[PDB]
Amino acid sequence: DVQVIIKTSYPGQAPQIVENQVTYPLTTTMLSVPGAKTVRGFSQFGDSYVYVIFEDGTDPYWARSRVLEYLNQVQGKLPAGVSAELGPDATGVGWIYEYA
Amino acid sequence: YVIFEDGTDPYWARSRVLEYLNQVQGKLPAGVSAELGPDATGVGWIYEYALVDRSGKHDLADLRSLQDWFLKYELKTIPDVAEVASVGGVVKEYQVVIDPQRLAQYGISLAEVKSALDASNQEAGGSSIELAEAEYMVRASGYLQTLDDFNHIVLKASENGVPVYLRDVAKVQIGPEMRRGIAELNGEGEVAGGVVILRSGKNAREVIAAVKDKLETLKSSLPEGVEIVTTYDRSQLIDRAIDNLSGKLLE
Amino acid sequence: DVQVIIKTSYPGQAPQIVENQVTYPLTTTMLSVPGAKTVRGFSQFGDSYV
Amino acid sequence: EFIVVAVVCALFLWHVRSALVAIISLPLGLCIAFIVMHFQGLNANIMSLGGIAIAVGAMVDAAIVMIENAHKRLEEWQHQHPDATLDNKTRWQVITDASVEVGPALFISLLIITLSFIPIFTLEGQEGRLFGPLAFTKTYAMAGAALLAIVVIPILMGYWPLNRFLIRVYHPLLLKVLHWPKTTLLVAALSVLTVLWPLNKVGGEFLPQINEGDLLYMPSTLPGISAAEAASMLQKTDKLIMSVPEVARVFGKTGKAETATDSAPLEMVETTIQLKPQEQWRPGMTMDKIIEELDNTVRLPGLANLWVPPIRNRIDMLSTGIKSPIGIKVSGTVLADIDAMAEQIEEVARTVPGVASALAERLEGGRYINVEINREKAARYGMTVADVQLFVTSAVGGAMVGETVEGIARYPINLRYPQSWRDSPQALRQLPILTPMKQQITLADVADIKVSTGPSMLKTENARPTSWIYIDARDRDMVSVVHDLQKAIAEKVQLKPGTSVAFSGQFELLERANHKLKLMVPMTLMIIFVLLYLAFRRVGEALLIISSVPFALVGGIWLLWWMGFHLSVATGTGFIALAGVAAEFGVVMLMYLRHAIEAVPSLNNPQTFSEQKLDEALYHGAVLRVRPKAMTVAVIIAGLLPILWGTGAGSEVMSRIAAPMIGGMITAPLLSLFIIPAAYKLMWL
């Protein structure tokens, strides 16, 4: 599907704090993006991931362009040093080649 | 307000305005930052309600907090609700008022008071140890919770003597932030309320139906005495117009 | 052709430093953009164009 | 498939150039399909080639029919006039007439096939993206074949033992059927009604287990383990996995790679086992037995084993998030209620006979060392909160402070106290504190430190906390165990206000596809009926030959039960495709029979009590029309048996799509051969 990943880093903050101050305003904001099917999200001791999966027949780039706007709109509310960075242009199924 | 030509994509315009916003951001003042607006316009004010309390119990400052921190998040999850705005009420504000006479006796300047006040609201623990059996994450407190915490912070330490506490130069209290909007019902008194703003280009009837259903299924969680009275609803006009046109066609 | 210019300013940094820390991560990153034919780039004593 | 179709055509017609004229329709159809899909922007994958391989026979049948008709007409002409006297003019004339006599019917039949398989484009989501290319290429191939058959085939047909046995076996049965048609229709109704027996035993799933050369290993464990212990567990489990003789490489890994597409924390194993080519083992060890051996060899108490292919596992994790095929999400707002409900459900699920394992994710499974910094004491010594928590964010911590550059590379810096000061909480309470007063004190004089429990990671779907339960069942069916778990957790477990339970994973997609397929049949039937009225211009014959698809469905489901396959979306597509082929066979039969009854016998019925010559017309419609139907059925079955018996890469889906059609093309034609003449004779009176 069309998936967009939002990874945010909050150095040294218990899961609850990072979920209240970082993940919640992002998961509730990305649910208003035009064409967002679902918004999964989980926060760990220092990080917060948010996966926005869109509806069917959506341009893979229109989705990113529309997520950037809401990212900018929510950036004004995040903590001092936190900054939400967009994910790459690939997904989990894109792991093509692996070497050691 | 940038209004574009006819036949322009509502999203192409925003994507093209973002670029020029970035281009001009380098010239703005130090702390100024231009933020884009929502995905709606002025004509998108679909539904409006007011939070009334006919018991004289809940103060004006509690209704607005309830709105902001419960309903703005419960209703924003509706599929095509562009925004939920709050009108009227009072915002809780920690006001620390300083007495010049008592401040001069101790010989403290405002810069130190400010630097000591705005440097005790951090919470961060970034270590990880092992208790001989498994991982152990590390926390660290530091958030400000109550009022006495404001009177328990020291500004300067007196060597082998009573340090000066914030309670000695400045007294704390709760107050209303400078109001930017006042609202009121028929003739009774001020009331806090909300405004639902719809996304440009979507149907209003479905959004109103969903909003009404959620506000109804939420009627049990609200405190005792608070009620939501609708002050503007656009579904009535839609129903009237559809009925009139259908009757005209039939006749 | 369709050309996009990226101008970055690094006040007072020898060409090599600005090329290692500014121009290289930009020239190597812009080569992954969908539809990028080529990515030219050069850095001077205080600036970097791509 | 091409070779077998050519062989069948050459064996049935017994003429090499006729076989060439018949098979030349396949390469040109393939070319047209490839050109159209290149114009659209598709690539060559399993689905496209599968669609073409499915359409091979359905595109050759219409050409072989016309070839046989031209053969018969030339034979009759030769029988009428002396041999050794012929020229291109009369031959071309008779061949063109013979081709025009039967063109329109087969053209409309190919159109029926195409526009009756077209309704499968309504699938949306994963199954839609999977079955889009198949339908696209099948439709393109069939359209090109119809075009060539109505345009090109006549030209190169004009340029260029076994049937006696069929007639001898058909004659008496046809006569005895025409004697009493009512009993024939009754036994047909009974043969349709006898379909309820296998429907119960046939299982149900989403898609077949498409097996590739590798497989993943992702066991579920508790997050309470260290780094060295995790590495040791990884080493031992990899060395145990390598003990199987069907493993070439093993690349285990815990934690995450330096990318945003991987959010796995430590304590989470994810190994990629590479299997030797399947030409390097006893030819009786399938993938299921390899998975069984792996599961039985690497028990390693402390892990919930799980084995899945990489591509399917990652697609599942992308579309739903649950790695296992079956999963249960417990939603709500309170963490304690959700955790208790997940525990209950996990404990009840592992009693179902088909389930192999069940594990619920714990929310409150995290150990914290809470350091409540008393502000009064911290102030008595003259030090803010930040100054007293810097002794744990940097000394007991080690947060970064900067990065040094070396050419292009960059490396971080650290700062922290020795290891002897983070041994135990009692070692923290003795941490030396240098107050701003240049004094010496401990950490217990300014803060109270204790140990407690709390959330380790907060998973929220749609801005609501959720707890996932991974189920693993490899022996029993999927829908069976799903229904069994539903009944169990609805019987012996009580719900709590504010929490819900939802089955996810493959079951949601299965239900969506099931509803789509259920509402997709009316469109197919309507298109078939419309295109049938377009050809016969009568509702009677249209309904007559459209009442033949039930036998096809019965045969398909019987073959599905017999082969051991389960009901999935592949079988649904197979049935939606088999309907059109059944309709096409019915059209051919009734067209030939109708020409028969039209030519001679339109004169004797006006005189009442005249049925002797009415049966001779049906006989003529079942003596001259036996070779075309047998040839069509033979080529249809032969162009599908290869992909049915195939055992390679990606053959699962194609075999599942082909089994229903091969099953139905044995029951629908065999019954039609007796139900079409019976009902038609009944209708003519």
Author numbering:
A (entry chain A): 44 to 143
B (entry chain C): 94 to 344
C (entry chain B): 44 to 93
D (entry chain A): 345 to 504, 516 to 1040
What does the paper say about this structure?
The Escherichia coli CusA membrane protein, which recognizes and extrudes biocidal Cu(I) and Ag(I) ions, belongs to the heavy-metal efflux (HME) subfamily of RND efflux pumps. Extensive classification of the single-particle cryo-EM images of the CusA-Cu(I) complex revealed that there were four distinct populations of the CusA particles with different conformations that coexist in the nanodisc sample.
The cryo-EM structure of this CusA trimer was solved to a resolution of 3.20 Å. The conformation of these three protomers is very similar to the conformation of the “extrusion” protomers of the EEB and EBB structures, with an “extrusion” channel observed to extend vertically through the periplasmic domain of each protomer with respect to the membrane surface. We, therefore, classify the conformational state of this symmetric trimer as the EEE form of CusA. In these simulations, we observed transitions from the “extrusion” state toward the “binding” state. This transition is similar to that observed with the monomer simulation and occurs independent of the adjacent subunits.
